[PDB]
Design an enzyme around this catalytic site. Structure first.
Site, PDB file in Angstrom:
ATOM      1  N   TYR A 271      -5.513 -13.261  12.209  1.00 50.06           N
ATOM      2  CA  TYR A 271      -4.670 -12.130  12.344  1.00 50.06           C
ATOM      3  C   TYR A 271      -4.144 -11.793  13.938  1.00 50.06           C
ATOM      4  O   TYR A 271      -4.663 -11.487  14.752  1.00 50.06           O
ATOM      5  CB  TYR A 271      -5.391 -10.865  11.912  1.00 50.06           C
ATOM      6  CG  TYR A 271      -4.727  -9.795  11.673  1.00 50.06           C
ATOM      7  CD1 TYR A 271      -3.633  -9.475  10.924  1.00 50.06           C
ATOM      8  CD2 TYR A 271      -4.906  -8.561  12.433  1.00 50.06           C
ATOM      9  CE1 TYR A 271      -2.774  -8.299  10.426  1.00 50.06           C
ATOM     10  CE2 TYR A 271      -4.325  -7.222  12.085  1.00 50.06           C
ATOM     11  CZ  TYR A 271      -3.041  -7.313  11.290  1.00 50.06           C
ATOM     12  OH  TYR A 271      -2.502  -6.039  11.078  1.00 50.06           O
TER      13      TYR A 271
ATOM     14  N   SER B 139       0.525  -8.023  -0.778  1.00 51.76           N
ATOM     15  CA  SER B 139       1.726  -7.641  -0.753  1.00 51.76           C
ATOM     16  C   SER B 139       2.947  -8.528  -0.369  1.00 51.76           C
ATOM     17  O   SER B 139       2.712  -9.671  -0.235  1.00 51.76           O
ATOM     18  CB  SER B 139       2.042  -6.475   0.677  1.00 51.76           C
ATOM     19  OG  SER B 139       1.521  -7.132   1.928  1.00 51.76           O
TER      20      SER B 139
ATOM     21  N   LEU C 258       3.391   1.009   7.585  1.00 46.73           N
ATOM     22  CA  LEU C 258       4.502   0.100   8.077  1.00 46.73           C
ATOM     23  C   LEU C 258       3.832  -0.615   9.191  1.00 46.73           C
ATOM     24  O   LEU C 258       3.036  -0.095  10.150  1.00 46.73           O
ATOM     25  CB  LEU C 258       5.840   0.718   8.483  1.00 46.73           C
ATOM     26  CG  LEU C 258       5.833   2.006   9.773  1.00 46.73           C
ATOM     27  CD1 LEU C 258       6.253   1.065  10.822  1.00 46.73           C
ATOM     28  CD2 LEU C 258       6.968   2.776   9.252  1.00 46.73           C
TER      29      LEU C 258
ATOM     30  N   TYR D 201       1.066  -1.058  -0.014  1.00 47.94           N
ATOM     31  CA  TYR D 201       0.037   0.091   0.050  1.00 47.94           C
ATOM     32  C   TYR D 201       0.727   1.296  -0.026  1.00 47.94           C
ATOM     33  O   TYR D 201       0.531   2.260  -0.568  1.00 47.94           O
ATOM     34  CB  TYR D 201      -0.947   0.164   1.221  1.00 47.94           C
ATOM     35  CG  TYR D 201      -2.281  -0.930   1.029  1.00 47.94           C
ATOM     36  CD1 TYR D 201      -2.883  -0.839  -0.024  1.00 47.94           C
ATOM     37  CD2 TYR D 201      -2.436  -2.079   1.932  1.00 47.94           C
ATOM     38  CE1 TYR D 201      -4.131  -1.759  -0.327  1.00 47.94           C
ATOM     39  CE2 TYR D 201      -3.675  -2.635   1.846  1.00 47.94           C
ATOM     40  CZ  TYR D 201      -4.490  -2.690   0.991  1.00 47.94           C
ATOM     41  OH  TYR D 201      -5.325  -3.356   0.761  1.00 47.94           O
TER      42      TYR D 201
ATOM     43  N   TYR E 244      -6.888  -2.229   9.971  1.00 45.37           N
ATOM     44  CA  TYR E 244      -7.520  -3.206   9.257  1.00 45.37           C
ATOM     45  C   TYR E 244      -8.803  -3.515  10.306  1.00 45.37           C
ATOM     46  O   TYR E 244      -8.649  -3.381  11.451  1.00 45.37           O
ATOM     47  CB  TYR E 244      -6.698  -4.310   9.160  1.00 45.37           C
ATOM     48  CG  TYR E 244      -7.304  -5.995   9.017  1.00 45.37           C
ATOM     49  CD1 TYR E 244      -7.818  -5.827   7.398  1.00 45.37           C
ATOM     50  CD2 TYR E 244      -7.329  -6.941   9.409  1.00 45.37           C
ATOM     51  CE1 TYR E 244      -8.369  -7.000   7.097  1.00 45.37           C
ATOM     52  CE2 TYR E 244      -7.487  -8.095   8.928  1.00 45.37           C
ATOM     53  CZ  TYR E 244      -8.527  -8.243   7.759  1.00 45.37           C
ATOM     54  OH  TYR E 244      -9.279  -9.260   7.553  1.00 45.37           O
TER      55      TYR E 244
ATOM     56  N   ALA F 248       4.755  -8.447   2.296  1.00 46.18           N
ATOM     57  CA  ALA F 248       4.630  -8.622   3.708  1.00 46.18           C
ATOM     58  C   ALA F 248       3.391  -9.775   3.872  1.00 46.18           C
ATOM     59  O   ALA F 248       3.889 -10.651   4.741  1.00 46.18           O
ATOM     60  CB  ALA F 248       4.285  -7.559   4.571  1.00 46.18           C
TER      61      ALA F 248
HETATM   62  N1  LIG Z   1      -3.515  -7.424   3.473  1.00 40.10           N
HETATM   63  C1  LIG Z   1      -2.866  -6.475   3.521  1.00 40.10           C
HETATM   64  O1  LIG Z   1      -1.665  -6.480   3.023  1.00 40.10           O
HETATM   65  C2  LIG Z   1      -3.290  -5.301   4.547  1.00 40.10           C
HETATM   66  C3  LIG Z   1      -4.486  -5.230   5.175  1.00 40.10           C
HETATM   67  C4  LIG Z   1      -4.763  -4.250   5.856  1.00 40.10           C
HETATM   68  C5  LIG Z   1      -3.984  -3.233   6.365  1.00 40.10           C
HETATM   69  N2  LIG Z   1      -2.717  -3.431   5.824  1.00 40.10           N
HETATM   70  C6  LIG Z   1      -1.737  -2.517   6.466  1.00 40.10           C
HETATM   71  O2  LIG Z   1      -0.876  -1.842   5.371  1.00 40.10           O
HETATM   72  C7  LIG Z   1       0.343  -1.300   5.796  1.00 40.10           C
HETATM   73  C8  LIG Z   1       1.321  -1.633   4.915  1.00 40.10           C
HETATM   74  O3  LIG Z   1       1.246  -3.030   4.357  1.00 40.10           O
HETATM   75  P1  LIG Z   1       1.439  -3.908   3.312  1.00 40.10           P
HETATM   76  O4  LIG Z   1       0.962  -5.379   3.497  1.00 40.10           O
HETATM   77  O5  LIG Z   1       1.164  -2.926   1.822  1.00 40.10           O
HETATM   78  O6  LIG Z   1       3.344  -4.253   3.760  1.00 40.10           O
HETATM   79  P2  LIG Z   1       4.601  -4.149   2.949  1.00 40.10           P
HETATM   80  O7  LIG Z   1       4.812  -5.437   2.104  1.00 40.10           O
HETATM   81  O8  LIG Z   1       4.760  -2.638   2.364  1.00 40.10           O
HETATM   82  O9  LIG Z   1       5.317  -4.305   4.496  1.00 40.10           O
HETATM   83  C9  LIG Z   1       5.145  -3.288   5.449  1.00 40.10           C
HETATM   84  C10 LIG Z   1       6.096  -2.267   5.377  1.00 40.10           C
HETATM   85  O10 LIG Z   1       6.332  -1.962   6.770  1.00 40.10           O
HETATM   86  C11 LIG Z   1       7.873  -1.929   6.733  1.00 40.10           C
HETATM   87  N3  LIG Z   1       8.401  -2.065   8.119  1.00 40.10           N
HETATM   88  C12 LIG Z   1       8.268  -3.047   8.732  1.00 40.10           C
HETATM   89  N4  LIG Z   1       8.979  -2.828  10.257  1.00 40.10           N
HETATM   90  C13 LIG Z   1       9.238  -1.686   9.979  1.00 40.10           C
HETATM   91  C14 LIG Z   1      10.369  -0.829  10.816  1.00 40.10           C
HETATM   92  N5  LIG Z   1      10.681  -1.318  12.097  1.00 40.10           N
HETATM   93  N6  LIG Z   1      10.504   0.381  10.330  1.00 40.10           N
HETATM   94  C15 LIG Z   1      10.379   0.673   9.144  1.00 40.10           C
HETATM   95  N7  LIG Z   1       9.816  -0.004   8.349  1.00 40.10           N
HETATM   96  C16 LIG Z   1       9.203  -1.034   8.770  1.00 40.10           C
HETATM   97  C17 LIG Z   1       8.415  -2.859   5.680  1.00 40.10           C
HETATM   98  O11 LIG Z   1       9.817  -2.841   5.388  1.00 40.10           O
HETATM   99  C18 LIG Z   1       7.463  -2.910   4.651  1.00 40.10           C
HETATM  100  O12 LIG Z   1       7.949  -1.716   3.674  1.00 40.10           O
HETATM  101  C19 LIG Z   1       0.669  -2.094   7.115  1.00 40.10           C
HETATM  102  O13 LIG Z   1       0.082  -1.091   8.240  1.00 40.10           O
HETATM  103  C20 LIG Z   1      -0.599  -3.171   7.047  1.00 40.10           C
HETATM  104  O14 LIG Z   1      -0.866  -3.555   8.493  1.00 40.10           O
HETATM  105  C21 LIG Z   1      -2.335  -4.443   5.102  1.00 40.10           C
END
Ligand SMILES: NC(=O)c1ccc[n+]([C@@H]2O[C@H](COP(=O)([O-])OP(=O)(O)OC[C@H]3O[C@@H](n4cnc5c(N)ncnc54)[C@H](O)[C@@H]3O)[C@@H](O)[C@H]2O)c1
Ligand SMILES: NC(=O)c1ccc[n+]([C@@H]2O[C@H](COP(=O)([O-])OP(=O)(O)OC[C@H]3O[C@@H](n4cnc5c(N)ncnc54)[C@H](O)[C@@H]3O)[C@@H](O)[C@H]2O)c1
Ligand SMILES: NC(=O)c1ccc[n+]([C@@H]2O[C@H](COP(=O)([O-])OP(=O)(O)OC[C@H]3O[C@@H](n4cnc5c(N)ncnc54)[C@H](O)[C@@H]3O)[C@@H](O)[C@H]2O)c1
Ligand SMILES: NC(=O)c1ccc[n+]([C@@H]2O[C@H](COP(=O)([O-])OP(=O)(O)OC[C@H]3O[C@@H](n4cnc5c(N)ncnc54)[C@H](O)[C@@H]3O)[C@@H](O)[C@H]2O)c1
Lengths: 297, 297, 298, 296
Positions: free
Chosen positions: C187, C227, C126, C21, C177, C229
């Site tokens: 989760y 993603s 993050l 995201y 979320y 992650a």
């Molecule tokens: N299904 C999903 O993917 C989903 C659903 C709902 C909400 N979200 C939220 O969206 C946000 C982005 O998630 P994404 O799935 O797109 O992930 P992504 O693959 O971008 O991973 C999360 C990011 O957090 C960074 N990160 C983790 N620990 C860190 C730290 N200590 N310092 C700096 N950076 C750090 C990682 O390097 C990565 O860039 C998160 O808050 C996630 O909880 C994701």
């Protein structure tokens, strides 16, 4: 008969005096016939035991019928520690912890099981936020995480360690505050964040413990009370509630005691995962009625 | 802990022993309250016949083995506030022959004359003539009838009973999750009427709490195979869904809501007003079904 | 003209590749004319910078007009640490952190101030929960507090250190979320509790930062996205299928869908919006029942 | 980023330039949408005249300096779904003289005939005849009129416009915090009608999302000195919000116009069934900060 708890056993975590919600809950559970054991923060355990054995609390222990509540045991309990290996050397050596032992959550659950058997009722009435007087913009990571460890994760750990010795159909309740859902200035230090985590955990544990143990898990979102922790500003919060709530009345610790007794009783056998407001209706208001923006009395 | 001796309750919406209204009435009587019923006039004769014949004796039986007895059973049509609102076709309708004084205002007058002031008021009634229709196929007339019968009827009950309720008294109504989240099949604007009803619960908590010192709350109940529900098999699917997806895997009985209503209408709930209490085996807390065809068995 | 961010600067914390995201939010901000700097977790910074420079990411950088987004800088940032003194020796010595310096939240905010000046827009995208696959009844205190430190307090700290360099009328957004409000099995690890704390802090910081800085603070509660992650934890696939089959809008959820909603919340169009949790999830949050339950007919 | 050229919008509940309806219509037109209006028939003549006279020229002015133009202004009375619903005394009322085809069903037919399918639907209309009465003094007739005018009218609009909306189209309505929490003075069953309206937004998001691929959302707005509001106190509500909300700033009709433009655009293509607060953050607060219970 409507609420009969005879033959049942309760553990109430977070009782160190007679002025807070934990005492009022324990008193209601005992009046309904439950055996009630207490968990007490170890540094204040001696003072509490002393005030019980001296007879200084006899008024506060009095029941409607005139007898005095008796506890099935008063256990030292520090809800910041799950198991013995988590306790640092400074704590073990702290004079305030001298002469108490076996006070981690896991050890307390083992002692309760040995001394009393399986329990039916679990109460979490404890919180601690070392930076509570700081706005969130001035709260350190250490203060914020201490709030969460002491006030939110302590409930998770209590269920993890008591869950296995709870009878099916048993029940657990914790205490929260409206700041978890809406902004209350002055409730700082990440305590609002911890109460939000705690209500979320109430729901998640309702699912997990409901499935694994047949145990119900709920929360009471209480209004302001001049407990010992609160008076250590609380006066302003109570005045605000008195002047803005649907019910214009004092909020007493017994009001929460009675609502907890319900959530912990067979009357509530279909109730799990709720946040029950016990706050004179204040949670329902979208506007203060004594705002200086509006005309007066 | 819950002693309602010396108190009087009026339960509006009881025509048989299968619904939530009956279960609430039964819990109030077991706790010592005098209980009067309000019954839709076309089914009053049938209900009175069932009671007097002994057909309901098993359903009337308390834990101690006595049978509940009612202080009166009153014809009540919650669609009509005053005699002037009743159209000629209704007054002449054969289903209303031999019954008189059934508007809300008239019933409140009769209760005051026969029983005196009341402490407890229950609204357990709803009617949506287009409930099987999706909202995209619901007419204005059906939608407004749902709201008139199911939401405004609670407002009017409080307007007419409020003046004869003792200070500290309480009212409760029954709602459903469809008010807050979409439940396919609960149509005809009944979801909209329950949302209005929960909003009115809050607004009346403020207005009746200020004016009368009366508490007003709602229970959001899970699915029950009442006579109203089984006449609309769909209720069977809704029950199965709840059984398979709720934190507590158990049947939901009308008594479960009876017990929760007893609490809300008792002095144990003296600080509780404006709430929506879920009595639904925890289902409301879930964010995902666990038996979805999208997930492994 | 309706969303014109020319002249504004954004900092997006938590971007290490093009599949999450964070990248979609950065891409939307850039398309509207904002200068966009990134914060990237130091262990994956090398790989990310290599991907950007090699051209591997050129297709993912492409805007509707055909230009490629450019970043005003890519900063190492570890949101577990607020100040240099908080960083333990075993981290400073870890080979994953070799060759990067100045990556605590306070030092990154200082470098942004020096390099770029005041900012208008702050994104927190993050999260990290080392015990996320564990049910809450099996989650340790250490894992639960790491989830909170990494995923909730990190937003508070970002606002504390970036707030003083945010222009009045600026805006911050974070991602949450549904698990914060209702139970979503799987989760775990205290991540549901961390997202609840994060939504609550969104409201509290809306008050505190709104009064002090005139800054808006909001959250997006997003649907499931495959993603890097998510796919590293076929669980994300099941979650996606469930949403597709049960939501009001039967369509795929793309990272760009959240990017567009974030662009709104971060723009002058949202000047009266603060403290909200906006669902961007094809309407799933509105549902009180699954429609493909085995309890119901097909 | 938001380009509505080629799309068509219908905005129900615009009778002057001071309310939220006008601000939404203006934002839609600035983004390039063709915008038709629905106007309560007794004020239709006055509104058309004020448009044609040039009196509204300042309020019509866009950032680039052109004036918004409407694709048509249709008489619409959202209390009536079909011609047979209209009582004789309304048909004969001089205020409805010389206007025809103003029930919701008829307006949707005229729109389809004149303009074709639409993409965007806005419901910005309410009426509660007993709004100044506490709920304990509100009659059944007043309560049901609030619901009919203010909640069911949105359902009816989707029922009749849904069939002529393009897939991926969008609808929005306006609500207020009184639906979820108690606001003294918002009486007459209007709080109850706004709660039913938010619930219906969710139910229609499901029904219209599945049937038409249409998104349906609500904006819960803060207080605005519209003509409807100043006719009824609104000054006290505005002061309260100014003094107690996270953002201390005036709330303008364009603030809600901007948020609606988002919800009605392709940027919001994954957004449906939401209640979006556009109220300077006031909804987030759990306590007033200028209460006489606390210090100044
Ligand atoms: N299904 C999903 O993917 C989903 C659903 C709902 C909400 N979200 C939220 O969206 C946000 C982005 O998630 P994404 O799935 O797109 O992930 P992504 O693959 O971008 O991973 C999360 C990011 O957090 C960074 N990160 C983790 N620990 C860190 C730290 N200590 N310092 C700096 N950076 C750090 C990682 O390097 C990565 O860039 C998160 O808050 C996630 O909880 C994701
Ligand atoms: N206005 C209020 O007082 C108010 C309002 C809403 C909710 N609550 C909640 O009610 C609960 C009871 O609070 P109270 O104000 O009645 O306080 P209290 O005076 O009973 O103090 C809190 C209790 O927690 C115990 N405690 C703190 N840290 C502990 C630890 N590590 N291990 C074991 N015990 C520990 C203290 O010894 C004390 O007994 C709390 O969760 C509080 O947040 C209080
Ligand atoms: N699954 C369920 O059964 C279910 C679920 C959630 C909530 N509820 C709620 O519980 C309440 C009671 O429902 P139940 O299912 O037990 O129903 P029930 O079988 O008792 O039928 C509803 C009652 O309303 C009475 N009633 C209807 N119109 C009336 C009028 N104009 N005047 C007087 N009485 C009238 C009927 O005579 C009947 O007693 C309702 O508000 C309902 O919405 C029911
Ligand atoms: N403070 C406020 O002004 C405020 C606050 C929150 C929400 N809202 C909501 O915003 C919306 C617009 O209100 P506003 O105050 O900008 O209003 P406004 O002054 O534009 O007046 C309301 C509009 O509704 C129209 N209307 C009323 N009955 C109608 C009918 N039967 N058929 C067709 N049109 C009808 C009126 O002609 C008028 O155009 C309403 O839903 C209102 O509840 C307003």
């Amino acid at each position: 008969f409507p609420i009969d708890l005879r033959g049942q056993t309760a553990f109430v975590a977070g009782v160190a005096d007679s002025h807070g919600y934990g005492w009022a809950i324990a008193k209601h559970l005992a009046s309904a016939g439950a055996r009630v054991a207490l968990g007490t923060w170890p540094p204040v355990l001696g003072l509490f035991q002393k005030s019980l054995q001296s007879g200084r609390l006899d008024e506060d222990r009095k029941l409607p019928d005139g007898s005095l509540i008796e506890f099935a045991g008063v256990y030292p309990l520090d809800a910041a520690f799950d198991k013995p290996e988590d306790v640092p050397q400074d704590i073990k050596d702290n004079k305030r912890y001298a002469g108490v032992d076996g006070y981690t959550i896991k050890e307390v659950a083992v002692k309760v099981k040995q001394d009393l058997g399986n329990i039916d009722i679990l109460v979490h009435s404890l919180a601690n936020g070392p930076e509570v007087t700081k706005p969130l913009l001035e709260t350190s990571r250490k203060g914020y995480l201490a709030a969460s460890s002491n006030s939110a994760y302590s409930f998770v750990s209590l269920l993890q360690h008591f869950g296995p010795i709870m009878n099916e159909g048993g029940s657990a309740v914790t205490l929260s505050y409206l700041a978890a859902e809406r902004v209350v200035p002055g409730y700082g230090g990440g305590m609002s964040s911890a109460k939000a985590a705690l209500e979320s955990d109430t729901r998640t544990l309702a699912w997990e413990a409901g499935q694994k143990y047949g145990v119900r898990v709920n929360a009471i979102s209480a209004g302001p009370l001049k407990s010992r922790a609160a008076s250590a500003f609380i006066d302003y919060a109570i005045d605000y509630s008195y002047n803005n709530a649907p019910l214009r009345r004092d909020l007493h610790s017994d009001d929460v005691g009675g609502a907890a007794l319900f959530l912990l009783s067979p009357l509530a056998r279909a109730v799990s995962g709720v946040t029950l407001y016990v706050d004179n209706g204040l949670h329902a208001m979208g506007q203060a009625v004594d705002s200086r923006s509006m005309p007066p009395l």
